[PDB]
């Protein structure tokens, strides 16, 4: 996570976009902050407030990150854009290209207490997109 | 406003971006929904929650839409990216180009009651960026 | 606070009454839920919505609960009924009597995020009447 | 309706009480404004905001007042207190006594555009309790 952002803000940068450009473009926003291009990434076509509400759902074991049990599954499916790296052959991150996979899925997020810099309007915030179902 | 979006969602698409790309790229997201390229546009580098807070500030006359008095001035400045159309003689919206002007200003928003499709976390939402100061 | 009520509901019961009966009658509603009769209490003659508006005013130090800084001062005065216990030597709560002091004052409230059981129309609600001015 | 109150405020005075006293006491608040004691009255043990939400439900023919079709049925039942006059024998309104009937029912309200004095937070407000079901 870039220090410029709280965990919730970085979550939103990586995973919330109401109307993302195609993945090869959308992924630049994330990969600029990285050593190497991200292998895969999902953008949920929803709002931050909608995801905060999912933090209020039943807490579950995080499917990917199974040392954690601060995960929460959405009650409903949301439209999304999945991005898959097609050229892991490195050189520079500006050269990374992605396959586009639009879809509609439930999502599972890890939620934590907010950063002091996050709005007091959300005591608990999403901090990681664990997986989609 | 495109029918796909509520007024609050369209406000966010046009005016909220924590880390926007340069204006010529950033403005495509907006201009795709327009007949002609937008002459100017400001992206506030803040969160939706922070803008909603402004809605609770003292109501004032809207500076640029003076038939309205449901405007609200922010209490603090925010970093932002202002975009200015530089080729209004553009053939197609795909070819519109913008000058970039990063800044830090107070802003004024018009706010209204939320749309049924908006998150219940905000009964009162920004619906227009009236101006910046 | 009685468990039957959210903090916002209990705030309303204690402090919001458009047309309260005289204090000796009005205070029974509160004192029924208490071990001992309340020494003083103000009923604001306003609406819940108007008090919620105050929550969006500038945050200040709570005058009477100075460990808190989630207080907010109203921008205008409201009519009110202040009640003062006149027989603290009362046998039972049924026998407590109050002096009536109608007035018109600014008020200061502490506000917090709503309870899951509160109406979604107000994500931020008054939870305590800190003082009047 | 007493001129001191908007239609929505008068609705709330007559029909919204989270914790009403027994009917003989509760009804004084209404009957003080009347020539003769009200024959019957229901207090809904809910909040104004909850009732405003019911104004968003399907519009129906008003069961009692059948010249109107701006009525709305609650989706769920609410606890309430019904009050029935037991001594229509007049003399003074201070002497009126009521039978208490606690219950839990759906309710039907007539809703209209708000008074300019009502909060802009509710464009539409309840103005009459038409019946309970």
Curated annotation (Swiss-Prot), chains A, B, C, D:
The record marks 33 as: May be involved in LPS-binding. One of its GO terms (biological process) is defense response to Gram-negative bacterium. Keywords: Antibiotic, Antimicrobial, Disulfide bond, Endonuclease, Glycoprotein, Hydrolase, Nitration, Nuclease, Secreted, Signal. Residues 1-45 are annotated as: Required for nearly all of the bactericidal activity. GO terms for cellular component: azurophil granule lumen; extracellular region; extracellular space. Substrate binds at residues 38-42. Its main location: secreted. It is an enzyme of class 3 (hydrolase). Glycans are attached at residues 57, 65, 92. The record marks 35 as: May be involved in LPS- and LTA-binding. The active site is at residues 15, 128. Disulfide bonds join 23-83, 37-96, 55-111, 62-71. It comes from the Eukaryota. It is found in: Secreted. The modification 3'-nitrotyrosine is found at residue 33. Belongs to the pancreatic ribonuclease family. Cytotoxin and helminthotoxin with low-efficiency ribonuclease activity. Possesses a wide variety of biological activities. Exhibits antibacterial activity, including cytoplasmic membrane depolarization of preferentially Gram-negative, but also Gram-positive strains. Promotes E.coli outer membrane detachment, alteration of the overall cell shape and partial loss of cell content. Interacts with bacterial lipopolysaccharide (LPS) and lipoteichoic acid (LTA). In vitro interacts with and insert into lipid bilayers composed of dioleoyl phosphatidylcholine and dioleoyl phosphatidylglycerol. In vitro, tends to form amyloid-like aggregates at pH 3, but not at pH 5, nor 7. This is Eosinophil cationic protein. The gene is RNASE3.
